[PDB]
Design a protein around this ligand. Structure first.
Ligand SMILES: *[C@H](Cl)C(=O)N(c1ccc(-c2ccccc2)cc1)[C@@H](C(=O)N[C@@H](C)c1ccccc1)c1cccnc1
Ligand SMILES: *[C@H](Cl)C(=O)N(c1ccc(-c2ccccc2)cc1)[C@@H](C(=O)N[C@@H](C)c1ccccc1)c1cccnc1
Lengths: 305, 305
């Protein structure tokens, strides 16, 4: 086996993607049971971008102002409400394709699969991670808003993200499916700064385990260290602090490789201080923080869905 | 928009994945119309690996020796034949989920989405490329054989690859859907060498265009060059020769960025001779040859399916 950025299969989420129009504004919705979820900025116009009062704009709006197309079949809107930054369009028909599902607020460092969508039509799927500045580094164009992030455990889709906007820096902001934004971002045309983005320490260590398990082991050295002393070095290279929970979570990988977590910390510390010398690990000249310990175990144990 | 390794949505291929058993041997099949395709090495045992005579082994085999499970529903095998290195199991039921489809022999340098499968169940999807040594650098474990590679154009799935084996080097070999292997590899337990793997020049230039279009433009320089003179440098760094077809194919990207192909060749030549200095392009410290000019235009123009 090699090691790739691997998304979950996207079949169960394709059957939930719908087109939502209002005015000239067409973005993607998510149709679960008899409710279609999308970003509320659908109700905004060219003028209202700097300072929209969404409450006022939604007073001007009725069910018929909302065009839901699932493929060619138009859906009758019989209900509309505002949950934080998402619009909930109650429709006449329950999505027959509705999979078993949950909404989850994921933590910074967690990853998910994005099914990038245009006009309610899936174009593509890729894996990415909730950066520690609560931004995501996705691949989104004009029309992508409403595209969703998700994980699949057992038979159940956990929706964790809905895409709302690109920031000045060309990185992406969105909400969970209760429409609370990840991070400090608002759905306004306003100067907003994503903060310092820091490396996901525990994820890099997952990747080093992945590299070892693939027989890619040059960076392993003769040294160990302490959390406290590794954390001193991490903080210098803008790496997130490693907790004892983080160490506990790397257990399965520790056990499977016979390499103690704190040894691997020593290998990481050396790589940070010395760089890689133009060498590569799992075919990359940089250190990869977008694989969790779970992703590694799934990809390296072979979990199916 | 950013730039990611982006697979096609995998919904239409999930509904085609089935489990094929024979003896202790369980691998994945592909169920199109009333025919289930899988690797013929399913009919082999622990002993027959060094030198199997597949013709002889298939004489010992009858329809009932083949267990096709689509989910929990078992399928009645009423037919079996050997097409090069693939087994064609004629079954009683036409797959109702069968999408519009084609089988294609793709060229070296072309890319596709792999839906990695275990026990007839999709685990994951990722993009990769037919290397110029006709190997692929995938993420496959024990049980993955029968997993397929594909592209989606319009509404039509083009199956291009079926996974058969991992080589000594941990890279992957397989066939098209008429069971002709890509490259010189045989479905035997024998010493087999994948040859020199060379960089896909035209794909790197697609990526440089992608980087520019994302506003990532440091490596652009004041120089131009000729094919002949760029090709002299490529061949030194084990880069595939660039043809005039390759230049023609980079047209849309040339036109969209206002940067002449041969200027970009000069930028590439400099990067090869000087390295990157610890700098990155589209968030990578290496040069990426697994995006075609099409992949870039899809991801950077926003094509849907
Ligand atoms: C949505 Cl289809 C879209 O592609 N946008 C976009 C997002 C949000 C709004 C908006 C928000 C509040 C009130 C009115 C309108 C409009 C469009 C593109 C986008 O996000 N552009 C950024 C620059 C933007 C930020 C803040 C306000 C307006 C625009 C877009 C482009 C590429 C990738 N994702 C999103
Ligand atoms: C298929 Cl599920 C599988 O995972 N294999 C595998 C492939 C081919 C054969 C085989 C071929 C001809 C006759 C008998 C048996 C058996 C198993 C794993 C694999 O390919 N192992 C390599 C080392 C192998 C090569 C040649 C002959 C036998 C084995 C495998 C493991 C990980 C990823 N992909 C495949």
């Amino acid at each position: 086996s090699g090691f790739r950025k691997m998304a979950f299969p996207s079949g169960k989420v394709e059957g939930c993607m719908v087109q939502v129009t209002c005015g000239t504004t067409t973005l993607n919705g998510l149709w679960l049971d008899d409710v279609v979820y999308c970003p509320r900025h659908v109700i905004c116009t060219s003028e209202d971008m700097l300072n929209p009062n969404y409450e006022d704009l939604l007073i001007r709006k009725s069910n018929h102002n909302f065009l839901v197309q699932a493929g060619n079949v138009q859906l009758r809107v019989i209900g509309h409400s505002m949950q934080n930054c998402v619009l909930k369009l109650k429709v006449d028909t329950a999505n027959p394709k509705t999979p078993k599902y949950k909404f989850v607020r994921i933590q910074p460092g967690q990853t998910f699969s994005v099914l990038a969508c245009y006009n309610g039509s899936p174009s593509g799927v890729y894996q990415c991670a909730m950066r520690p500045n609560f931004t995501i580094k996705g691949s989104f164009l004009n029309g992508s808003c409403g595209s969703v992030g998700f994980n699949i455990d057992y038979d159940c889709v956990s929706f964790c993200y809905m895409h709302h906007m690109e920031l000045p820096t060309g990185v992406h902001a969105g909400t969970d499916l209760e429409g609370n934004f990840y991070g400090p971002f608002v759905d306004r045309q306003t100067a907003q700064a994503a903060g310092t983005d820091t490396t996901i320490t525990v994820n890099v260590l997952a990747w080093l385990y992945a590299a070892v398990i693939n027989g890619d082991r040059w960076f392993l050295n003769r040294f160990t260290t302490t959390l406290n002393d590794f954390n001193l070095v991490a903080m210098k290279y803008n790496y997130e602090p490693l907790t004892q929970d983080h160490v506990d979570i790397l257990g399965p990988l520790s056990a499977q490789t016979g390499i103690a977590v704190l040894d691997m910390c020593a290998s990481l510390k050396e790589l940070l201080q010395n760089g890689m010398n133009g060498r590569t690990i799992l075919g990359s000249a940089l250190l990869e923080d977008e694989f969790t310990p779970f992703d590694v175990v799934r990809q390296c144990s072979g979990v199916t869905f």
